[PDB]
Subunit: 372 residues, 2 copies
């Protein structure tokens, strides 16, 4: 497997321990308002998702260019990444629609010559084992990153390639191995062509198939995004699963890799409204919600190093998120640099920062943040 490059921070985002280091990961079907652009530009690192303002600009490619330009005019130090899925042919890319229309052989088929699909039964996959597909995909990423207001790319679906059962259950064992081989070739290409840019990947993840829970695959990338971080599987308890995720993240962060930890608040916010009635306004000062914020931030702070950033979200679509435009009080208070690594005692972790003491209990899913 690809080895990690010597650390070069030249192209990394801004970072400070002064207050919570924050990540943004977002889409909207129409253009952001001026207020929303100002909000985006306040984050040190922003990923622009798929379906980026396509109902204003006609396509994600043009919506991305317009959004990134507007962000950079407000804060040219903000780093902006372009989302790209390595295997799933999601909608609203004008250039992908044209490529697939003209070249139907670009899509992935099973051994019986049938197109295979995501669970919606309609979104197909790029057959990245084909040279012309690799070249199209690599050029699409390189061309977008080369534009003036894009700093790098967020590569998604690495784990669908690398967990053998995902594709072997669709296209067979040999085709899965071929998809994996081509994936590694394509990542090697980007590691070189984007060496003056940033590459973030959705890669660190507790998996029985990954001996090092994704750390073994970080060699191509400047860092990892994390999801599924508190969603246990494989018969593991929630606490056992988080213990492994925390260990992987600590090791990655301490190696100098960017970490963008995402943790969902959607379950803590949902109030059984919004389907056939108005979604009831959420009290963002609610005591119980803020205990959940403390808990999720404690998980993050137990792992964090320089270039670690957090997003507590209610989905990535701006117009359907109850936390859009909101700054929790925990994001404004003085944090300060760590005074040491986290200390682990069973499922209880503690960590000291210059202006904050963290206590975390994974078993009870509780934490205390004692701000100084």
């Amino acid at each position: 497997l690809e080895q990690n490059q010597e650390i070069d921070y030249s192209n990394y985002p801004e970072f400070s321990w002064d207050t919570m280091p924050l990540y943004m990961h977002v889409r909207k079907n129409t253009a952001y308002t001026d207020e929303e652009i100002n909000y985006l530009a306040s984050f040190p690192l922003i990923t622009l998702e798929k379906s980026q303002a396509q109902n204003t600009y006609g396509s994600t490619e043009e919506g991305t260019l317009a959004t990134a330009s507007a962000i950079k005019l407000k804060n040219n130090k903000a780093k902006v990444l372009y989302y790209r899925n390595v295997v799933i042919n999601w909608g609203n890319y004008k250039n992908d629609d044209e490529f697939i229309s003209k070249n139907p052989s670009a899509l992935l088929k099973n051994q019986n010559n049938e197109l295979v699909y995501m669970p919606n039964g309609s979104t197909p996959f790029f057959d990245i084992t084909k040279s012309f597909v690799q070249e199209y995909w690599l050029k699409s990423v390189e061309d977008m990153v080369a534009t003036p207001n894009i700093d790098g790319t967020f590569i998604d679906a690495n784990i669908k390639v690398l967990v053998p059962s995902f594709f072997s259950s669709k296209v067979g064992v040999n085709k899965q191995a071929e998809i994996e081989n081509s994936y590694f070739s394509m990542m090697s290409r980007l590691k070189e062509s984007l060496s003056n840019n940033l590459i973030l990947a959705n890669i660190i993840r507790v998996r029985p198939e990954f001996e090092e829970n994704g750390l073994e695959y970080l060699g191509y990338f400047n860092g990892s995004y994390l999801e599924g971080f508190d969603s246990e599987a494989f018969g593991m308890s929630n606490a056992e699963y988080l213990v492994e995720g925390i260990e992987a993240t600590q090791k990655a962060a301490q190696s100098g890799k960017i970490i963008t930890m995402t943790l969902g608040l959607g379950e803590a916010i949902d109030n059984n409204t919004g389907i056939d009635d108005q979604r009831e306004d959420v009290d963002l000062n609610d005591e119980e919600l803020n205990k959940r914020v403390d808990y999720l931030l404690a998980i993050f702070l137990i792992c964090a190093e320089k270039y670690s950033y957090v997003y507590l979200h209610d989905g990535y679509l701006a117009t359907n998120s109850a936390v859009w435009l909101h700054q929790f009080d925990q994001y404004k208070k003085a944090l300060g640099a760590p005074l040491g690594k986290a200390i682990k005692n069973g499922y209880i972790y503690t960590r000291k920062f210059e202006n904050l003491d963290v206590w975390l209990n994974l078993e009870t899913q509780t934490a205390t943040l004692t701000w100084k």
Copy 2:
């Protein structure tokens, strides 16, 4: 109460409902499965990637079903306010008439939670007429027996639209909605109209029965999903009471109850979706419980669907017959008896015992 257009019904075994879409044409085996149900609703996005549109995919599917079993009743889904995709005629109508879509007071489109699906402005007469004719034209085709009218509750709960387009516009949407339902009640009087209408709601003193006069029956969803601070058991008590009243009056009931949560197994997102053992003891206890809720309510022309979503290609129960669907059921020997949260009912070949509080049931087949 004219029953001449109603579906077939038998108590011999479980009376079953099907409610389905697929992005491409059904296989022959799938058509045979559909034709085995007495009542089938064809959802939106109906084989549009084979036939080019939901309109033509519906026509092809219905024709094939009726060729296998001409007694099966087939309903066409139609949403009264949401402009969902894949209707070629709606796309043409909306392209030509952008003013057909609902806008707020600043003339901005308003949307569903996905931020991209808009709504018909049914306050406009030309929109009412387009919509009504679209339903009447499809129902007039030879292999379609009626329509499934969806999103009634989004019109009738004032906050749904008032929070989007203001209080005056919601009141106008509601007035127009009632005019449209009165029109369909008359034009489809030789056909079937099923509506997604019975629902426990604080806004509905009778939990949807007060609107049921427009329709031949109700589909039920959200039936075991409590809200409004109510307990799960009391929420079900109120839904059961509404459903019993409707069914006893001769209205069609199509009860849908999700198995998705008892089937989900924490796989299938980034790995292969592991098989659910359809013969598992725990899954079968869940089936028993959901069927017991149905059987406590059911009358002639009540039908049940225990589902894993309406998309055929993503459902673990597609093509499957649980053993509980094959065993002799027989006619009820009396109405259900309620003793607290425990209900009992006797059928010729089955005794039902249901406890809402523990979410368990016992089906004693004879």
